[PDB]
Coordinates of C-alpha atoms in Angstrom, one line a residue:
Chain A
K1 CA 5.0 -22.7 -48.4
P2 CA 5.5 -24.3 -45.3
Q3 CA 5.1 -28.1 -46.9
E4 CA 7.5 -27.0 -49.6
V5 CA 10.2 -26.3 -47.1
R6 CA 9.6 -29.5 -45.4
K7 CA 10.0 -31.5 -48.9
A8 CA 13.5 -29.8 -49.0
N9 CA 14.2 -31.7 -45.9
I10 CA 12.7 -35.0 -47.1
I11 CA 14.9 -34.8 -50.3
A12 CA 17.9 -34.0 -48.1
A13 CA 17.1 -37.0 -45.8
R14 CA 16.5 -39.4 -48.8
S15 CA 20.1 -38.5 -49.9
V16 CA 21.6 -39.7 -46.6
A17 CA 19.8 -42.9 -46.8
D18 CA 20.9 -43.6 -50.4
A19 CA 24.5 -43.2 -49.4
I20 CA 23.9 -45.7 -46.4
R21 CA 21.8 -47.9 -48.8
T22 CA 24.9 -49.3 -50.7
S23 CA 26.7 -50.1 -47.3
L24 CA 24.0 -52.5 -46.2
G25 CA 25.1 -56.0 -45.5
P26 CA 28.7 -57.5 -45.2
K27 CA 28.8 -57.2 -49.4
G28 CA 28.1 -53.8 -49.0
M29 CA 30.0 -50.7 -50.5
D30 CA 32.4 -49.1 -48.2
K31 CA 32.3 -45.3 -47.8
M32 CA 35.4 -43.1 -47.8
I33 CA 35.1 -40.0 -45.4
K34 CA 37.8 -37.4 -44.6
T35 CA 37.4 -35.8 -41.5
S36 CA 38.4 -32.1 -41.2
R37 CA 41.3 -32.8 -38.9
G38 CA 42.9 -34.9 -41.4
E39 CA 42.0 -38.4 -40.4
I40 CA 41.0 -40.9 -42.8
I41 CA 39.0 -43.5 -42.0
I42 CA 36.6 -46.2 -43.8
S43 CA 34.1 -48.9 -42.9
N44 CA 30.9 -50.7 -43.8
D45 CA 29.2 -50.0 -40.3
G46 CA 26.4 -47.4 -40.7
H47 CA 26.8 -46.5 -36.8
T48 CA 30.1 -45.0 -37.5
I49 CA 29.5 -43.4 -40.6
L50 CA 26.8 -41.1 -39.5
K51 CA 28.7 -40.5 -36.4
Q52 CA 31.5 -38.9 -38.1
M53 CA 29.6 -37.5 -40.9
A54 CA 29.0 -34.5 -39.1
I55 CA 25.8 -33.7 -40.6
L56 CA 24.7 -30.2 -40.4
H57 CA 21.2 -30.5 -41.4
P58 CA 18.5 -30.4 -38.5
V59 CA 16.3 -33.2 -39.8
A60 CA 18.8 -35.2 -41.0
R61 CA 20.6 -35.5 -37.6
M62 CA 17.3 -37.8 -36.5
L63 CA 18.6 -40.9 -38.2
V64 CA 21.9 -40.3 -35.9
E65 CA 19.9 -40.6 -32.8
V66 CA 17.9 -43.5 -34.0
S67 CA 21.2 -45.2 -35.0
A68 CA 22.2 -44.9 -31.6
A69 CA 19.1 -46.0 -29.9
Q70 CA 19.2 -48.9 -32.6
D71 CA 22.6 -50.1 -31.3
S72 CA 21.5 -49.3 -27.4
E73 CA 18.5 -51.3 -27.5
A74 CA 18.6 -54.2 -30.1
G75 CA 22.3 -53.7 -31.1
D76 CA 22.0 -54.3 -34.6
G77 CA 20.3 -53.2 -37.8
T78 CA 21.5 -49.6 -37.3
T79 CA 22.0 -49.7 -41.2
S80 CA 18.8 -51.1 -42.0
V81 CA 16.7 -48.5 -40.0
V82 CA 18.2 -45.6 -42.0
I83 CA 17.1 -47.4 -45.4
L84 CA 13.6 -48.1 -44.0
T85 CA 13.1 -44.7 -42.8
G86 CA 13.8 -43.4 -46.2
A87 CA 11.3 -45.8 -47.7
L88 CA 8.6 -44.2 -45.7
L89 CA 9.7 -40.7 -46.9
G90 CA 9.7 -41.5 -50.5
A91 CA 6.3 -43.1 -50.1
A92 CA 5.0 -39.7 -48.3
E93 CA 6.2 -38.0 -51.1
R94 CA 3.4 -39.2 -53.6
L95 CA 0.9 -38.8 -50.7
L96 CA 1.5 -35.0 -50.5
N97 CA 0.9 -34.8 -54.2
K98 CA -2.6 -36.2 -53.5
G99 CA -3.4 -33.5 -50.8
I100 CA -3.1 -35.7 -47.8
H101 CA -2.1 -34.2 -44.6
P102 CA 1.0 -35.4 -42.9
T103 CA -0.8 -36.1 -39.6
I104 CA -3.0 -38.9 -41.2
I105 CA 0.4 -40.3 -42.6
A106 CA 1.9 -40.1 -39.3
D107 CA -1.2 -41.5 -37.4
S108 CA -1.5 -44.4 -40.0
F109 CA 2.2 -45.4 -39.2
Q110 CA 1.3 -46.1 -35.7
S111 CA -1.4 -48.5 -36.5
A112 CA 0.9 -50.1 -39.3
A113 CA 3.6 -50.3 -37.0
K114 CA 1.8 -52.2 -34.2
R115 CA 0.1 -54.5 -36.8
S116 CA 3.4 -55.4 -38.1
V117 CA 4.6 -56.7 -35.1
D118 CA 1.6 -58.9 -34.1
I119 CA 1.8 -60.3 -37.7
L120 CA 5.8 -60.9 -37.1
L121 CA 4.9 -62.7 -33.8
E122 CA 2.7 -65.2 -35.5
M123 CA 5.4 -66.5 -37.6
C124 CA 8.2 -66.1 -35.2
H125 CA 9.1 -69.4 -33.2
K126 CA 9.0 -68.7 -29.6
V127 CA 12.1 -69.9 -27.7
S128 CA 12.8 -70.2 -24.1
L129 CA 16.0 -69.0 -22.2
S130 CA 16.3 -72.4 -20.4
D131 CA 17.5 -74.2 -23.6
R132 CA 21.3 -73.5 -23.7
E133 CA 21.7 -75.2 -27.0
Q134 CA 19.8 -72.5 -29.0
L135 CA 22.0 -69.8 -27.2
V136 CA 25.5 -71.2 -28.2
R137 CA 24.5 -71.5 -31.9
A138 CA 22.9 -67.9 -32.0
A139 CA 26.1 -66.5 -31.0
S140 CA 28.6 -68.6 -32.6
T141 CA 27.0 -67.3 -35.9
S142 CA 27.7 -63.8 -35.2
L143 CA 31.3 -64.6 -34.8
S144 CA 31.7 -66.0 -38.0
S145 CA 31.7 -62.4 -39.3
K146 CA 35.1 -61.7 -38.0
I147 CA 38.7 -63.0 -38.6
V148 CA 38.3 -65.1 -35.5
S149 CA 36.6 -68.4 -36.3
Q150 CA 38.1 -71.5 -35.0
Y151 CA 38.8 -69.9 -31.6
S152 CA 34.9 -68.6 -31.6
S153 CA 34.1 -72.0 -30.1
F154 CA 35.1 -71.4 -26.6
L155 CA 33.7 -67.8 -26.7
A156 CA 30.0 -69.0 -27.4
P157 CA 29.5 -70.3 -23.8
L158 CA 31.2 -67.3 -22.3
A159 CA 28.7 -64.7 -23.6
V160 CA 25.9 -67.2 -22.9
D161 CA 26.5 -68.1 -19.5
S162 CA 27.2 -64.6 -18.4
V163 CA 23.6 -63.4 -19.3
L164 CA 21.8 -66.5 -18.0
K165 CA 23.0 -65.6 -14.6
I166 CA 21.7 -62.1 -14.7
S167 CA 18.7 -62.8 -16.8
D168 CA 16.3 -64.2 -14.0
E169 CA 12.6 -64.2 -15.1
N170 CA 10.9 -61.1 -16.7
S171 CA 13.5 -58.8 -16.5
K172 CA 12.5 -56.8 -19.6
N173 CA 15.5 -54.6 -20.4
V174 CA 19.0 -56.0 -19.7
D175 CA 21.6 -53.4 -19.6
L176 CA 24.9 -54.6 -21.2
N177 CA 26.9 -51.6 -20.0
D178 CA 27.1 -53.5 -16.6
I179 CA 29.0 -56.2 -18.6
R180 CA 32.4 -54.9 -19.2
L181 CA 34.8 -56.7 -21.5
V182 CA 38.6 -56.2 -20.0
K183 CA 41.2 -55.8 -22.6
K184 CA 44.6 -56.7 -21.3
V185 CA 48.0 -57.1 -23.2
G186 CA 49.2 -61.0 -23.5
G187 CA 47.6 -64.3 -23.3
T188 CA 45.4 -66.0 -25.8
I189 CA 41.9 -66.2 -26.9
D190 CA 41.5 -69.6 -25.1
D191 CA 42.5 -68.1 -21.8
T192 CA 39.2 -66.6 -20.2
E193 CA 38.1 -66.2 -16.6
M194 CA 34.4 -65.3 -16.1
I195 CA 35.1 -64.0 -12.3
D196 CA 31.2 -63.3 -11.7
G197 CA 31.8 -61.0 -8.8
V198 CA 33.7 -58.2 -10.6
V199 CA 36.9 -57.3 -12.3
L200 CA 39.0 -54.2 -12.0
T201 CA 41.0 -52.1 -14.8
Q202 CA 43.9 -51.5 -12.4
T203 CA 46.8 -53.3 -10.9
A204 CA 48.1 -53.3 -7.2
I205 CA 51.1 -51.6 -5.3
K206 CA 54.3 -52.5 -6.9
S207 CA 56.1 -50.9 -3.9
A208 CA 57.3 -52.3 -0.7
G209 CA 54.8 -53.2 2.1
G210 CA 51.6 -53.7 -0.1
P211 CA 50.0 -56.7 0.7
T212 CA 48.5 -57.4 -2.7
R213 CA 46.2 -59.9 -1.0
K214 CA 43.4 -59.6 1.7
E215 CA 40.8 -62.1 3.1
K216 CA 37.4 -61.1 4.1
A217 CA 37.6 -57.6 2.6
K218 CA 35.3 -54.5 2.5
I219 CA 35.9 -52.5 -0.6
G220 CA 34.7 -49.1 -0.7
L221 CA 35.2 -46.0 -3.3
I222 CA 36.8 -42.9 -2.0
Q223 CA 36.9 -40.3 -4.7
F224 CA 39.4 -38.7 -2.4
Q225 CA 43.3 -38.8 -2.4
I226 CA 45.7 -39.0 0.3
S227 CA 48.6 -36.5 -0.2
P228 CA 50.5 -33.8 1.2
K229 CA 37.4 -51.7 9.6
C230 CA 38.3 -50.8 6.0
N231 CA 40.9 -53.7 4.7
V232 CA 40.5 -52.4 0.9
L233 CA 40.1 -48.9 -0.3
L234 CA 40.1 -47.2 -3.9
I235 CA 41.6 -43.8 -4.6
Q236 CA 40.8 -41.9 -7.7
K237 CA 43.4 -41.3 -10.4
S238 CA 44.6 -37.7 -10.8
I239 CA 47.7 -36.7 -12.7
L240 CA 47.6 -33.1 -11.4
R241 CA 48.9 -34.0 -7.9
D242 CA 50.1 -37.0 -6.1
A243 CA 47.5 -39.5 -5.8
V244 CA 48.9 -41.8 -2.8
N245 CA 51.9 -40.4 -0.8
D246 CA 54.8 -43.1 -0.3
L247 CA 54.5 -42.4 3.3
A248 CA 50.8 -43.2 3.5
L249 CA 51.7 -46.6 1.8
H250 CA 54.1 -47.6 5.1
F251 CA 51.2 -46.1 7.3
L252 CA 48.5 -48.3 6.0
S253 CA 50.8 -51.4 5.6
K254 CA 51.3 -51.5 9.2
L255 CA 47.6 -51.4 10.0
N256 CA 47.0 -54.3 7.2
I257 CA 45.0 -52.1 5.0
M258 CA 45.3 -53.2 1.1
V259 CA 45.5 -50.2 -1.0
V260 CA 44.8 -50.0 -4.6
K261 CA 45.3 -46.3 -6.2
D262 CA 45.1 -44.8 -9.9
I263 CA 41.4 -46.1 -10.5
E264 CA 40.5 -44.9 -13.7
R265 CA 37.5 -42.2 -13.5
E266 CA 35.3 -43.7 -16.3
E267 CA 35.1 -46.9 -13.8
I268 CA 34.0 -45.0 -10.8
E269 CA 30.3 -45.0 -11.9
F270 CA 30.7 -48.4 -12.9
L271 CA 31.6 -49.5 -9.7
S272 CA 29.3 -47.6 -7.7
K273 CA 26.6 -49.8 -9.3
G274 CA 27.6 -53.4 -9.5
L275 CA 29.2 -53.2 -5.9
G276 CA 26.2 -51.5 -4.6
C277 CA 28.5 -48.8 -2.7
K278 CA 28.3 -45.3 -2.7
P279 CA 30.9 -42.5 -3.5
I280 CA 32.8 -40.7 -0.6
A281 CA 33.8 -37.3 -1.2
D282 CA 35.2 -36.5 2.2
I283 CA 36.6 -38.5 5.1
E284 CA 34.2 -36.6 7.2
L285 CA 31.2 -38.5 5.7
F286 CA 33.1 -41.6 5.4
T287 CA 31.5 -44.6 7.1
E288 CA 31.6 -48.4 7.3
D289 CA 28.0 -48.6 5.8
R290 CA 29.0 -47.2 2.5
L291 CA 31.6 -50.3 1.9
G292 CA 31.3 -53.6 0.2
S293 CA 31.4 -57.3 1.2
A294 CA 34.1 -59.7 -0.3
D295 CA 35.0 -62.8 1.1
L296 CA 38.6 -63.2 -0.6
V297 CA 40.7 -60.4 -2.6
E298 CA 43.9 -61.8 -4.3
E299 CA 46.0 -60.9 -7.5
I300 CA 46.2 -63.3 -9.8
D301 CA 48.5 -62.7 -12.9
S302 CA 48.2 -65.3 -15.8
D303 CA 51.0 -63.7 -17.8
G304 CA 52.0 -60.2 -17.2
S305 CA 48.4 -58.9 -16.2
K306 CA 48.9 -58.6 -12.5
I307 CA 45.1 -58.2 -11.9
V308 CA 43.4 -58.4 -9.0
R309 CA 39.7 -60.3 -8.5
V310 CA 36.8 -60.4 -6.0
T311 CA 34.1 -62.7 -5.9
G312 CA 31.3 -63.4 -3.7
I313 CA 29.8 -59.7 -3.1
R314 CA 26.8 -61.0 -1.6
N315 CA 24.8 -57.7 -1.6
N316 CA 21.1 -57.8 -1.6
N317 CA 20.5 -54.2 -3.5
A318 CA 23.3 -55.0 -6.0
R319 CA 23.2 -57.9 -8.3
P320 CA 25.6 -60.4 -9.6
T321 CA 27.4 -57.9 -12.1
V322 CA 30.0 -59.9 -14.4
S323 CA 32.9 -58.5 -16.2
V324 CA 34.5 -60.9 -19.1
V325 CA 38.3 -60.4 -19.2
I326 CA 39.8 -61.1 -22.8
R327 CA 43.2 -61.7 -23.4
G328 CA 45.4 -61.8 -26.5
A329 CA 48.7 -61.0 -28.0
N330 CA 48.9 -58.3 -30.7
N331 CA 46.4 -55.3 -30.2
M332 CA 44.2 -55.8 -32.9
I333 CA 43.1 -59.2 -31.4
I334 CA 41.4 -57.9 -28.4
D335 CA 40.1 -55.2 -30.0
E336 CA 38.3 -57.1 -32.9
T337 CA 37.1 -59.6 -30.3
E338 CA 35.8 -56.8 -27.9
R339 CA 33.5 -55.6 -31.0
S340 CA 32.4 -59.2 -31.9
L341 CA 31.5 -60.2 -28.4
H342 CA 29.7 -57.1 -27.8
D343 CA 27.3 -57.9 -31.0
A344 CA 26.7 -61.3 -29.5
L345 CA 25.7 -60.0 -26.2
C346 CA 23.1 -57.7 -28.0
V347 CA 21.6 -60.6 -29.9
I348 CA 21.5 -62.5 -26.8
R349 CA 19.8 -59.3 -25.1
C350 CA 17.1 -59.2 -27.7
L351 CA 16.2 -62.9 -26.6
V352 CA 16.1 -61.9 -23.2
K353 CA 13.7 -58.9 -23.4
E354 CA 11.6 -60.4 -26.0
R355 CA 11.5 -64.3 -26.7
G356 CA 11.3 -65.7 -30.0
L357 CA 13.3 -65.8 -33.0
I358 CA 13.0 -65.4 -37.0
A359 CA 15.1 -66.3 -40.1
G360 CA 17.1 -63.1 -41.2
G361 CA 17.7 -62.3 -44.9
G362 CA 14.6 -60.1 -45.8
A363 CA 12.2 -63.2 -45.2
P364 CA 9.6 -61.8 -43.1
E365 CA 9.6 -58.5 -44.8
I366 CA 8.1 -60.2 -48.1
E367 CA 5.2 -61.9 -46.3
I368 CA 4.5 -59.1 -44.3
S369 CA 3.8 -56.9 -47.5
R370 CA 1.9 -59.6 -49.0
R371 CA -0.7 -59.9 -45.9
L372 CA -0.9 -56.1 -45.4
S373 CA -1.7 -55.6 -49.1
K374 CA -4.8 -58.3 -48.6
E375 CA -5.7 -56.7 -45.4
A376 CA -5.8 -53.2 -46.8
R377 CA -9.3 -53.8 -48.2
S378 CA -10.7 -54.2 -44.8
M379 CA -10.0 -50.4 -44.1
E380 CA -11.7 -47.3 -45.9
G381 CA -10.9 -43.9 -46.7
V382 CA -7.4 -42.4 -46.9
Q383 CA -5.9 -44.7 -44.3
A384 CA -6.8 -47.8 -46.8
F385 CA -4.3 -46.5 -49.3
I386 CA -1.7 -46.0 -46.8
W387 CA -1.5 -49.8 -46.3
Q388 CA -0.8 -50.3 -49.7
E389 CA 2.2 -47.9 -49.6
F390 CA 3.6 -49.0 -46.5
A391 CA 4.0 -52.5 -47.6
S392 CA 5.5 -51.3 -50.6
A393 CA 8.0 -49.3 -48.2
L394 CA 9.1 -52.5 -46.4
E395 CA 10.2 -54.3 -49.6
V396 CA 13.3 -51.9 -49.9
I397 CA 15.4 -54.0 -47.2
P398 CA 15.2 -57.2 -49.1
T399 CA 15.8 -55.5 -52.4
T400 CA 18.8 -53.8 -51.2
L401 CA 20.4 -57.0 -49.9
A402 CA 19.8 -58.6 -53.4
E403 CA 21.5 -55.6 -55.1
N404 CA 24.5 -55.3 -52.8
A405 CA 25.0 -59.3 -53.2
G406 CA 25.5 -58.8 -57.1
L407 CA 22.6 -60.6 -57.8
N408 CA 19.9 -59.5 -60.0
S409 CA 17.7 -57.0 -58.1
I410 CA 14.2 -57.6 -59.7
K411 CA 14.8 -61.3 -60.0
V412 CA 15.6 -62.3 -56.5
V413 CA 12.8 -60.4 -55.3
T414 CA 10.1 -62.1 -57.4
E415 CA 11.5 -65.4 -56.3
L416 CA 10.9 -64.2 -52.6
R417 CA 7.1 -63.8 -53.2
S418 CA 6.9 -67.0 -55.1
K419 CA 8.4 -69.2 -52.5
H420 CA 7.0 -67.9 -49.6
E421 CA 3.5 -68.7 -50.7
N422 CA 3.5 -72.5 -50.1
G423 CA 6.2 -72.2 -47.1
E424 CA 6.1 -70.2 -43.9
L425 CA 9.8 -68.7 -43.1
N426 CA 11.4 -71.7 -45.1
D427 CA 13.5 -69.6 -47.4
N428 CA 16.8 -71.6 -46.7
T429 CA 18.7 -69.5 -44.2
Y430 CA 17.7 -71.7 -41.3
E431 CA 20.4 -74.5 -43.0
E432 CA 22.7 -71.7 -43.5
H433 CA 22.6 -70.7 -39.8
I434 CA 21.1 -67.3 -40.4
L435 CA 19.1 -66.3 -37.1
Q436 CA 18.0 -62.7 -36.8
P437 CA 16.2 -62.0 -33.2
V438 CA 12.7 -60.7 -33.5
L439 CA 13.6 -57.7 -31.3
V440 CA 15.9 -56.1 -34.2
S441 CA 13.1 -56.8 -36.9
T442 CA 10.7 -55.1 -34.2
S443 CA 12.8 -52.2 -33.1
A444 CA 13.8 -51.2 -36.5
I445 CA 10.2 -50.8 -37.5
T446 CA 9.2 -49.2 -34.1
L447 CA 12.2 -46.5 -34.5
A448 CA 11.3 -46.1 -38.0
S449 CA 7.6 -45.1 -37.3
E450 CA 8.8 -42.6 -34.6
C451 CA 11.9 -41.0 -36.8
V452 CA 9.5 -40.5 -39.9
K453 CA 6.8 -38.9 -37.4
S454 CA 9.5 -36.6 -36.0
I455 CA 10.5 -35.5 -39.6
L456 CA 6.9 -34.6 -41.1
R457 CA 6.0 -32.9 -37.8
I458 CA 8.4 -30.0 -38.6
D459 CA 6.6 -27.4 -40.6
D460 CA 9.3 -24.7 -40.7
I461 CA 12.4 -23.8 -38.9
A462 CA 13.9 -20.4 -38.1
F463 CA 17.1 -18.8 -36.4
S464 CA 16.9 -19.2 -32.5
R465 CA 19.6 -17.9 -30.3
Chain B
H1 CA 51.5 -71.8 -74.7
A2 CA 48.3 -72.7 -75.9
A3 CA 49.3 -76.0 -77.8
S4 CA 51.7 -76.6 -74.7
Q5 CA 48.6 -77.2 -72.5
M6 CA 46.6 -79.2 -75.3
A7 CA 48.7 -82.6 -74.6
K8 CA 49.4 -81.8 -71.0
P9 CA 46.4 -83.4 -69.0
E10 CA 46.7 -86.2 -71.6
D11 CA 50.3 -87.1 -69.8
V12 CA 51.6 -87.4 -73.2
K13 CA 53.7 -85.2 -75.4
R14 CA 55.8 -85.3 -78.5
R15 CA 56.8 -81.4 -79.1
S16 CA 55.1 -80.1 -76.5
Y17 CA 57.1 -78.1 -73.8
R18 CA 55.9 -75.8 -71.2
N19 CA 57.8 -73.0 -69.4
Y20 CA 58.7 -70.7 -72.1
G21 CA 59.8 -67.5 -71.1
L22 CA 60.8 -64.0 -72.7
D23 CA 64.7 -63.5 -72.5
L24 CA 64.9 -59.3 -73.5
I25 CA 68.9 -59.9 -73.7
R26 CA 69.3 -61.8 -76.8
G27 CA 65.8 -60.8 -78.0
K28 CA 64.5 -64.2 -78.5
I29 CA 61.9 -66.6 -76.5
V30 CA 63.7 -69.3 -74.3
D31 CA 63.1 -70.9 -71.1
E32 CA 64.2 -68.9 -68.3
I33 CA 64.7 -72.0 -66.3
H34 CA 67.8 -72.6 -68.2
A35 CA 68.3 -68.9 -68.8
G36 CA 68.9 -68.5 -65.2
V37 CA 66.0 -66.7 -64.1
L38 CA 64.1 -68.1 -61.5
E39 CA 61.8 -66.7 -58.6
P40 CA 60.6 -68.2 -55.1
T41 CA 56.7 -69.2 -54.8
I42 CA 56.7 -67.0 -51.7
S43 CA 57.5 -63.9 -54.0
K44 CA 54.7 -64.4 -56.5
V45 CA 51.9 -65.8 -54.1
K46 CA 52.1 -62.9 -51.9
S47 CA 52.6 -60.6 -54.8
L48 CA 49.4 -61.8 -56.4
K49 CA 47.3 -62.1 -53.2
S50 CA 48.0 -58.7 -51.9
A51 CA 47.5 -57.2 -55.4
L52 CA 43.8 -58.1 -55.3
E53 CA 43.4 -56.9 -51.7
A54 CA 44.1 -53.2 -52.6
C55 CA 42.1 -53.5 -55.7
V56 CA 39.1 -54.8 -53.9
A57 CA 38.9 -51.5 -51.3
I58 CA 39.1 -49.3 -54.1
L59 CA 35.9 -50.6 -56.0
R60 CA 34.1 -50.7 -52.8
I61 CA 34.1 -46.9 -52.5
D62 CA 31.0 -45.5 -54.2
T63 CA 31.3 -42.1 -52.3
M64 CA 33.9 -39.7 -51.4
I65 CA 33.4 -37.3 -48.6
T66 CA 35.8 -34.4 -47.7
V67 CA 35.0 -31.7 -45.5
Chain C
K1 CA 47.2 -43.7 -50.8
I2 CA 45.7 -47.2 -50.5
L3 CA 48.8 -47.9 -53.1
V4 CA 51.1 -46.3 -50.8
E5 CA 50.4 -48.9 -47.9
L6 CA 50.5 -51.6 -50.3
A7 CA 54.0 -50.7 -51.4
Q8 CA 55.1 -50.8 -47.9
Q9 CA 53.8 -54.1 -47.2
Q10 CA 55.9 -55.8 -50.0
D11 CA 59.0 -54.2 -48.9
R12 CA 58.6 -54.9 -45.2
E13 CA 58.0 -58.9 -45.9
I14 CA 59.5 -59.8 -49.3
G15 CA 61.4 -56.6 -50.3
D16 CA 61.0 -57.3 -54.1
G17 CA 58.2 -57.4 -56.9
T18 CA 56.5 -54.0 -55.4
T19 CA 56.8 -52.4 -58.8
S20 CA 55.0 -55.4 -60.3
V21 CA 52.0 -55.6 -57.7
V22 CA 51.3 -51.7 -58.6
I23 CA 50.8 -52.6 -62.2
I24 CA 48.6 -55.7 -61.9
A25 CA 46.4 -53.5 -59.6
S26 CA 46.4 -50.8 -62.0
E27 CA 45.1 -52.6 -65.2
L28 CA 42.1 -54.4 -62.8
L29 CA 40.8 -51.0 -62.1
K30 CA 40.6 -49.9 -65.6
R31 CA 38.9 -53.0 -67.1
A32 CA 36.4 -53.1 -64.0
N33 CA 35.2 -49.4 -65.2
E34 CA 34.6 -50.7 -68.5
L35 CA 32.3 -53.3 -67.0
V36 CA 30.3 -50.4 -65.7
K37 CA 28.5 -49.8 -69.1
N38 CA 27.9 -53.6 -69.2
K39 CA 25.8 -53.5 -66.2
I40 CA 28.1 -55.7 -64.2
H41 CA 27.8 -55.5 -60.7
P42 CA 30.9 -54.8 -58.5
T43 CA 30.3 -57.3 -55.8
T44 CA 30.3 -60.0 -58.9
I45 CA 33.5 -58.4 -59.9
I46 CA 34.9 -58.6 -56.5
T47 CA 33.5 -62.3 -55.8
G48 CA 34.7 -63.4 -59.5
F49 CA 38.3 -62.5 -58.5
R50 CA 38.0 -64.1 -55.0
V51 CA 37.0 -67.4 -56.5
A52 CA 39.5 -67.1 -59.2
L53 CA 42.2 -66.2 -56.9
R54 CA 41.5 -69.2 -54.6
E55 CA 42.1 -71.3 -58.1
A56 CA 44.7 -69.6 -59.5
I57 CA 47.2 -70.5 -56.4
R58 CA 46.0 -74.1 -57.1
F59 CA 47.1 -74.0 -60.8
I60 CA 50.1 -72.5 -59.8
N61 CA 50.8 -75.2 -57.1
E62 CA 50.8 -77.7 -59.9
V63 CA 53.6 -76.2 -62.1
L64 CA 55.9 -75.7 -59.2
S65 CA 59.0 -77.9 -59.1
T66 CA 62.1 -77.9 -56.8
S67 CA 65.9 -77.4 -58.2
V68 CA 66.1 -80.0 -61.2
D69 CA 68.4 -80.5 -64.3
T70 CA 71.4 -80.8 -62.2
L71 CA 72.7 -83.8 -64.3
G72 CA 72.8 -83.5 -68.3
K73 CA 72.0 -79.7 -68.2
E74 CA 73.1 -76.7 -66.4
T75 CA 70.7 -74.0 -64.2
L76 CA 72.8 -72.1 -61.7
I77 CA 75.6 -71.6 -63.9
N78 CA 73.7 -69.2 -66.1
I79 CA 72.7 -67.0 -63.0
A80 CA 76.5 -66.3 -62.1

């Protein structure tokens, strides 16, 4: 029974989706997870639940990879994509009882996903990146879900102005890993410096002889360490042996060469991209062509930070990589602010790759299910019946939102089909400032079609070592 | 307290008095203001608000995962 | 363990009334579980408490009063 073995994995996969189903939305139910090490963590984020769940089931681990790609591409909807995946698995259970092979089930999802996107783009309102008033109100609403509210007014133009410089035109995917959120102890939320050139994670030399400032400097990346025309050099942090000898600090001080040591190993790959330089393993291969370009290098300390900033890289291959600096008093300030602004950059990232926006709250899922139900008569054969089950599987997202909010399940869903007939995208979430970008709803359906496909295509599993 | 709040919003009262306490020493119901039992506002507001904060987090857990 | 952190929150700030806080939170959980058979949604139970909590503080603020009854009566005398 090769199909019955797969049905056992489908039931186990739907059980995971039912656990995440209660956590959907800000009013969703939290989940308590106790790790084997003894750490007790709790949260409503579906991405953090599936990461620490330590699923031993081979097929159920696909939801973790989809949730990882959901946050890496769209950045939002990691919880809803798991529920949407379980809906197609439940709809395919009745298909297997009718004698339908999963290939037709998987192939029809490709035509259903591409059709759902084209229908979604018809009702979507196309927006342009040249309008700065739309991007401020879009990121400001995403910051209302956190403790910081009144201080988020100055954080809205911070995320908008950083993307517009690197957006250009027809950039398609824009990696947010190049945008670094600098978390330093001290200061306040209202104190922020863009410093579009670059921002490091480390301080300067506190010993005697260190210039700490240099004009017209070339910054290279050196993975080597000095232990028993380059103005500024970087030394990789190594706790095993000594990084930079005290005698070497006095030697380079006479040569008017600024030294910054103890560079974090995580930022080595980050600085090799935005600065457009190359890592130098050995001094024998160390040349001038691998250096950077900096007009002025200075160390500016607001309060206690003692951080060095660089501006005007002016590199042809490299681009204006911007690092955002975040200040705050308590540790819980710069932390929650980091995750809040990270989700704001993901919403802006969705508008750059795909223009247009829609109103959230399960509004498009109702009309798409209505249009696909009427268009199902245009097809013929087994594929025609799949369009009817695919439309019913899209109604689980708006139904769960009504269940987790305390409202009547079946009553609110009927009110959606009734109001959406006369009006178009009017139900009002636009007056409530609820805006979900179209790329999130597009990626949630696209990744669900590939996730359910990779499930049904497994007809058996055996021990392999 | 039932008959005490009936004439309270009317801004007129005859036998209606509020702030009836419980005296367990003498075993009778008297006003705690005259009895000498008083508590600050900071103590009662933070005790009532924090009590619900822990009650919500308990009702939001529908699943317990333990390795 | 949630009530353990709740007990430490009242001690580090007010330092008094920790016993009364645990009793209040214990009865709320007993009455909330009885609403499960009544088909009452937990979020409505949570929202019903948050809306009532904001209005309860307003009602408490109406009966608050400063030190009074200094002339004609005695208050601080019965304390000592």
